[PDB]
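Input for the complex:
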Amino acid sequence: PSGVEGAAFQSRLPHDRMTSQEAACFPDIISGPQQTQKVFLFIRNRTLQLWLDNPKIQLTFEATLQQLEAPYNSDTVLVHRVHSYLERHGLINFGIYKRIKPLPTKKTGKVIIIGSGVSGLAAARQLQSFGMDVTLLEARDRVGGRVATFRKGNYVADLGAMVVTGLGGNPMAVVSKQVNMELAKIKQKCPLYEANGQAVPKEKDEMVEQEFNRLLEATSYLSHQLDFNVLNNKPVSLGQALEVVIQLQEKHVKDEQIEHWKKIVKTQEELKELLNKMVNLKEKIKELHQQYKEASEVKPPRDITAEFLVKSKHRDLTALCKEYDELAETQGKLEEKLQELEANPPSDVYLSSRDRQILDWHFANLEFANATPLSTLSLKHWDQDDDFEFTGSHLTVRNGYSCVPVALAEGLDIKLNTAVRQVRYTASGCEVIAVNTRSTSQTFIYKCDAVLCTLPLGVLKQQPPAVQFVPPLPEWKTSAVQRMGFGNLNKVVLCFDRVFWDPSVNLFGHVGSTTASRGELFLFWNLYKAPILLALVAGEAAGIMENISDDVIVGRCLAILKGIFGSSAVPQPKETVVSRWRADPWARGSYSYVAAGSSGNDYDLMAQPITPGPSIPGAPQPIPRLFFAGEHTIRNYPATVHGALLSGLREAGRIADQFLGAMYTL
Amino acid sequence: RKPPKGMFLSQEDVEAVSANATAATTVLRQLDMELVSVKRQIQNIKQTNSALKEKLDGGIEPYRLPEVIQKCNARWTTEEQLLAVQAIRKYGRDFQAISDVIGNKSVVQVKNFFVNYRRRFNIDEVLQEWEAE
Ligand SMILES: [C]C1=C([C])[C]=C2C(=[C]1)N([C][C]([O])[C]([O])[C]([O])[C]OP([O])(=O)OP([O])(=O)O[C][C]1O[C](N3[C]=NC4=C3N=[C]N=C4[N])[C]([O])[C]1[O])C1=NC(=O)[N]C(=O)C1=N2C(=O)/[C]=[C]/C1=[C][C]=[C][C]=[C]1
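Predicted:
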């Protein structure tokens, strides 16, 4: 869309309707007259538009009312109420703007934020900008969390996030105007190369892929139309559902052949019956002729009974001859309606072994996309977030994604090398206990009003617990941590003295040998200004590779690469790095996914803040003290940088409301 | 609405490949056998058929009797009458064969005949004796 409505859509909001969370705060308006609703909407859209048109400076209430129009710019409490709501939930003035009113003299409330992964950072900036006292505690010695970027000389490569998923209402859209990231598009062109080391024909490539997409939708039909969602008590995975469909395909392939040859026999067996009839006719025709010959040797003149005999046997014969001509007639028809059948047999196979194997790469890709074995993705929900996807084409950060957290981090109080070990939260406050990662006996205590927890799901899953909650997290929240899926995927970074791949290609795939190893180095990325290649280890393979030395790994790499590019167009790599995210203590994996038997509704559970019991019993019910953000908390944008960033905005909005009071709901 | 066309997925078929641990490769194998068990029986009957084709080798060519090109008539030579009476005894109501035997009489002059000489050829008797066989 475009104009004011451009902004509404570009901000993830319906241009012509009020959201649930708008109703929440403007219950007067939404329950009120259609007329007023439409003013509101415009006001909202317009303000957005202004912020959007220019997000390198703050957008004040004044500056808004300024550019507004009568009738709209008549009611200035509406304008204030709207510009405030917007400001508060980070729809406007989020990220990195230039202030206009430098930051109000003294602060208010104190919040401890665990972990300076993007979610963390974005929430911290928000809060600080809302005049609060904010400290973030980070276990690592750098910001960014799962946004690692490797740097050395002019080598630059993310082992972290890597792709921006296209600017169609992506908040990163703004971030990227505010920060100098160089965004290069991802040329969708991706050649495949079998174990042998030779391209896969344009012929095949397409047959397989297209079968792949066909297979996917197939599962969707199974799921929704046939209701194949439980199976002897376990939830059905996508993997299961795929195999079941493939089987059913092979079953049909045979099914057909069977009833095709079954047609041959039923025909070849009419030919059999006819021939018998035909032989036994030549049998009478033989012996009958004889008798006519015999009856002709009685020489005339003959009496009438003997004359009759001749004439009679003569007819009887030309009669029997009639039939046999008509039967060799029929015979001919059948004999051809029989190469008819031998000319077009149904297909030999469903998929060949070179097929099943390429198809297997298309699965690896899906495993790479969801960081998991398809045997673990929920069939019913694995793709629930599919609707909310941005428009436009995926990109990469040419100068390293890390430039973004670094950017956000600027201005903030961040304790690096500070591993939170215990969160205790009570009616009157919280205290957080961290240690120093370098000498771990050396101890820290932080007192605050609220804790925003941006710990990775992996971490929150750990047994036994790496962070301990006091009191324990309510069971409803812990079940949700169990049920959800935290996946895994790893990168390998290859650094050379010269380009030797197709420079106009961004990504080529390698086709593995077995189902079991579809993920092993299945795809490579030429992304960068230096000669760097980047290779993925996804699916089942990912977890296994983390148990194998870097050399061995880089081995299998060069191997695969020589195989494609010629056994000595491929030099030794100057510099190599190899992630192990399931290993890494401050992540324990890569990003969440919708495990079988979970739903989207679990992501919502993750976000629900915690409210301590009362202190002195029968005192009034407290404020909520413990809140959560981060990638695993945002139902509609899981497992992504923008998704995190946005969870951060979310919680910061929510906390500010709670502690600084919502002035704008009146 | 329906499976993306090409894919086959009956309700009934699904419950069948799920039933147990390897109903999967079971049912896929019944057909694997079931198939060769037909392909084989094609051979048998392709062979049985092939021998019968060799018997028929020769056609019926040495046995076919030249064209009786002769022309229809009206008179009833006493010969023609006797031929008739005997054709009746051997053919019943097959007016067609009876005409064929007397060569030069129409399938109708025949039916006619049946009613003129019916009288003095006891064609009643004649016919009831063809029936008795
Ligand atoms: C792993 C990964 C890779 C390798 C790649 C990628 C990814 C991943 N993705 C995802 C993202 O990255 C995520 O989501 C984010 O980043 C997250 O964030 P947050 O939530 O904020 O979290 P973090 O970061 O982790 O942070 C946290 C923090 O905390 C801390 N800690 C822990 N523990 C502790 C602490 N502190 C104190 N104490 C204690 N105890 C840590 O350390 C940290 O800092 C992505 N995304 C996007 O957007 N893009 C991209 O590209 C990506 N990547 C890739 O490649 C693929 C995937 C995808 C894409 C697209 C779509 C879908 C998917």
